[model samples]
Target: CGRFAQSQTREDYLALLAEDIERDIPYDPEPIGRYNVAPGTKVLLLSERDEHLHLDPVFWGYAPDKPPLINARVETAATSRMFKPLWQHGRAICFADGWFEWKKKQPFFIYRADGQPIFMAAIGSTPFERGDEAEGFLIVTAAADQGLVDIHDRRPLVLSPEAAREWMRQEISGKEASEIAASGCVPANQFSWHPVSRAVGNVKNQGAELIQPV
Candidate 1:
């Protein structure tokens, strides 16, 4: 996903995702609200480490050496060489209030019709494994079906809470992770979207109103 929004902050995160969390990392970042998050933003990621749930403000977008790899396709991520290692051990989940998509230069804010927090399945490096090459992560995406195709051919894999928790289990096997992502993605019909202020095109415009239906 090119852009997303996570308006809920520290307290909200703890309130919703604290269940079954074994350990919590301090992420009281400077900017409390992330209403207009873009690629390269230092995003909060929840993962399992040392046999307990862990969280950190790891950099977004997988950078190797301008264009960092931000979204990894489900069809090939499991086979992609650079991602294979992350798939096996670097699995993580990111929280998002919603994500943005573009069409004819207009931006639309998309979120769960039920208005629940989205648990995005991701594969990452850096925060978990120190690698000077790149300190970032990639949001795993799947082929979008239904009317969502009208907006974008792909969408982030939003997993059910159950599947998401299993995805980050400390001992989760690659095989199990793959199945969870495939079976857990919410259907397109369960999502809703509307055109929003073009101001969203600029990373600087981050007010709650920016996401209001225009």
Candidate 2:
């Protein structure tokens, strides 16, 4: 459900985190330049295996038997069988310069007010293709804090840098993921949201205009 990502070039976003894949989970990542993004697109996601971190490409959506899921409720994921396993044993942190959300005919791009790119505490697992071979991820969201509730009813969970590191530790508990999602998030006031052109809804349009303020 996102378009016009933070990368200006492939190297922009991919280059920032290009490190020795053989390193530990918390290795410092590179800086991404900028790239236009669209749904059904592959983006880099950093994850850990046996405490070792590796970068991989993930499609950006979540689908289930009931409905296509692009956002998971941080408050209820642990209890939902669909997300419990990943929430427990398989957790990851998503890095992004910004993310897009839409409201009927309008769209908005949001980022940390600190002017820093953001990382989201995410849940994931080994996804397999059976029928159409579509792959992706879903952002976890909760009721917006007091500051951001005016822009949207739900807001994506944002992880603190400290919490981001803890979440990548293999030694962390399954409940750790849940705890992080529940407690982890940028303060509502910590963000800046702006209306952008609806051109962002299209998967083909790319460039500064897609993100320019409407």
Candidate 3:
């Protein structure tokens, strides 16, 4: 799990959404951005149903009777007994400015070098059963390579905008979703990261500039 994500303002991530996608979440004219979206926070989720694409705010992980479930590995989610159903019916995408990873005593903020929103592949417990964690979702991840592994061996399975839309289609098989994610990722070379304030690890400190290169 990246453990933290930067969910910027609507204008920040609007680029990744299609024009026809509708917001079903509390429509914030200029929503307050979250620099640190910790596990259990309500993250913005995009999903499709009745042939309509909609955005909602859903809790990011399971209700913790145990450690909350937050991430599913992409390599195995399709066949995983726990995630298979979600793979088929609960597929979704999360919009983010970027995410954070820690190594040694340092924390780094990772994002597209060109400064675009990320379309992170995810799965959920939908028809959005409830606003709580029971209806939570988790990001899908893959083993990172291309030097990024040094920052964190695992990272969110971020996809191209087109692939992100396909993943939420009303009728794509789990296999096809997996294939699109494999081929459509922006790739590690297109990503960049830099040390950020350690205050980010506290989750209490939040500001758009929290991710400004230290």
Candidate 4:
């Protein structure tokens, strides 16, 4: 029900986070901009390390021991046996300019009306074994808000910068983080979506134009 995205350059995304976290991390030599980020791709995520926030690249899917899981339903993530431990131990935020959804084969790009990047709530864990290919991160999803329900039944859990900082705190409990994720849902009206080229339906398609309104 959810796939595709528009992303800012790594520098741009780090600048946005600096507004809240105030730390200088190394730039990713690897490319960070993407208009069509799919599952299994290496994506940026913010996590706690050495008592500070560290920006790192993580695989887009969770469950390092099994097939990559690109998403985890927020409603059950806290209690689900497979996700609970990671939900409790690993908390992160994924940055995006916007994400895409579909309705009857038609694709639409949804983004914050404010034109700023959105931070998605996520959970992650290290690989179960050495040399595993799984990316330890998975985007958290919740019931769609009014603006997005028409496009899909689920949407990523978005948070304000302040909330994102709070959720990333090293001392925050899993229950508290989940509460923050559930409570910080941006208003449906805060976002808008427009129909985009159906070309996005193909996993191979990649370009800023893919998110352009048709």
lDDT of each structure? 0.81, 0.63, 0.80, 0.76
Least well predicted 10-residue stretch by lDDT in candidate 2: 126-135
lDDT of 2 by residue, 46-123 (tens): 666755665567765666555445667887887888888767755666777777777656788887787666767666
Q: Per-residue alpha-carbon lDDT of model 1 for 1-214, expressed as tens digits?
A: 7899988765565455555446666656444577898887777788887777777777787875477888888888888887877888889988888899898588888888988878898998735535333558889999877988888778899888778878888687777788888888888888899999899999989898978999
lDDT of each residue in 1-214, candidate 4, tens digit only: 3565645666666565555445546655555657888887676678776666677667777654556788889999999989888888778888888888888688888888988878888888843122235646888888898867788888888888778878777688888987888777776788988999988878888877998998
Clashes of each: 0, 12, 0, 0
On TM-score, the leading prediction is: 3
Give the Cα error of residue 59 in candidate 1, in Å.
Answer: 0.7
| Clash pairs for candidate 4 | none
Question: Least lDDT summed over 10 consecutive residues: which range in candidate 4?
Answer: 126-135
Question: RMSD per prediction, one decimal?
Answer: 2.4, 4.4, 2.0, 2.8
Whole-model alpha-carbon lDDT for candidate 3: 0.80
Question: How good is model 1 by TM-score?
Answer: 0.90
Model 3 C-alpha lDDT per residue in residues 1-214, reported as the tens digit of each score: 6555655566556556666345444445675478888887887688887776777778888542576888999888899988988898889888887889998689998888888878899998887635765659999998987978888789899888888888888689888887888998879998899999888888788777778889
Question: Each model's TM-score?
Answer: 0.90, 0.78, 0.91, 0.88
The deviation in Å at residue 173 for candidate 3 is 1.1
Error of 2 at 74 (Å): 0.6
